[PDB]
Ligand binder design. Structure first.
Ligand SMILES: COc1cc(/C=C/C(=O)O)cc(OC)c1O
Ligand SMILES: *[C@@H]1O[C@H](CO)[C@@H](O)[C@H](O)[C@H]1NC(C)=O
Ligand SMILES: *[C@@H]1O[C@H](CO)[C@@H](O)[C@H](O)[C@H]1NC(C)=O
Length: 275
């Protein structure tokens, strides 16, 4: 199996590309994992960057969808009201449409849709968690920024965004970050997907202060405190923080790691309940 492009997946308000990896042996009613590239990258680039994901698809029979952004220096829109809001439009709605296309065409399991991404893609994974909790069951954000930090910014790239968020200059209370999540879908009554975040202490692109802000955000959303910590988990220097009963939010801080934390497929697939 290799990566191939979907020319028409339906309405595409973000004007994005869609690339798909379908293993030769699919599960019955396969899961779908959306895998999101970083700024200046591409769908084909992220497919080759996270080399462990496609073999994991082969072994477990789930589908990988790689959306691609060709706007704003190949960055995901995490700034406009449209992209930040449930059913708003722009990139987030295009990605959801890619998901709906995949579930319909490949008889996928709509209760097993997940997303993971790095930097800009991690930022979008948290947008998808807050704005589309009715679509995604779990997200894994590697080296990103809390949901809503860039709201109202004139762009989402190193050359167009307000740089306060990437510089780690934005700090808000857990309650304020929870309020941000609720603004993604005002009046939403339901639950949110499992959230797993990662960051490196040496990240010179996206400040590790953003890790603290993401922790405040999702601990508040789920109403949980740290209950367990694992050192050198899953790798030396990685500190794993487990919240509440462990079913909704966990966080990893990697000592000495920069931009970005390499995807840990076992940790992320187990979080999604797929292995
Ligand atoms: C959202 O605004 C930003 C996104 C990224 C993303 C980087 C990446 O995806 O690799 C970097 C920024 O400044 C360095 C920045 O201000
Ligand atoms: C949430 O519940 C209220 C009633 O309590 C209802 O008016 C509203 O439509 C619900 N929200 C959604 C997104 O269905
Ligand atoms: C979280 O910690 C705060 C501060 O100690 C406490 O007030 C709150 O009750 C805790 N929440 C729990 C244990 O669910």
């Amino acid at each position: 199996a290799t990566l191939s492009q979907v020319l028409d997946f339906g309405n595409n308000p973000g004007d994005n590309e869609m690339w798909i990896y379908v293993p030769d042996q699919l599960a019955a009613n396969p899961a779908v994992i959306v895998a999101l590239h970083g700024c200046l990258g591409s769908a084909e680039g992220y497919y080759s960057e996270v080399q462990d994901l496609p073999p994991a698809a082969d072994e477990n029979g789930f589908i990988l969808v790689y959306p691609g952004s060709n706007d704003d220096f190949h960055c995901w829109d995490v700034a406009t009201a449209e992209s930040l809001t449930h059913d708003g439009g722009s990139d987030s709605r295009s990605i959801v449409n890619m998901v709906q296309y995949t579930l319909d065409k490949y008889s996928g399991d709509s209760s097993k849709v997940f997303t993971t991404g790095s930097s800009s893609g991690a930022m979008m994974s948290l947008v998808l968690a807050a704005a589309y909790p009715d679509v995604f069951s779990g997200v894994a954000a590697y080296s990103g920024v809390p949901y809503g930090c860039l709201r109202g910014s004139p762009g989402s790239s190193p050359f167009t965004a307000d740089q306060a968020c990437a510089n780690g200059e934005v700090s808000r209370t857990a309650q304020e970050w929870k309020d941000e999540v609720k603004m993604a879908w005002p009046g939403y009554n339901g639950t949110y997907p499992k959230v797993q975040v990662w960051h490196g202490t040496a990240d010179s692109v996206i400040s590790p202060n953003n890790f603290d802000e993401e922790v405040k955000q999702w601990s508040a959303v789920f109403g949980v405190n740290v209950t367990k910590e694992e050192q050198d988990s899953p790798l030396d220097g990685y500190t794993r923080s487990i919240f509440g009963d462990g079913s909704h939010f966990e966080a990893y801080l990697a000592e000495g790691v920069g931009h970005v934390v390499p995807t840990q497929v076992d940790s992320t697939l187990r979080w999604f309940g797929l292995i």
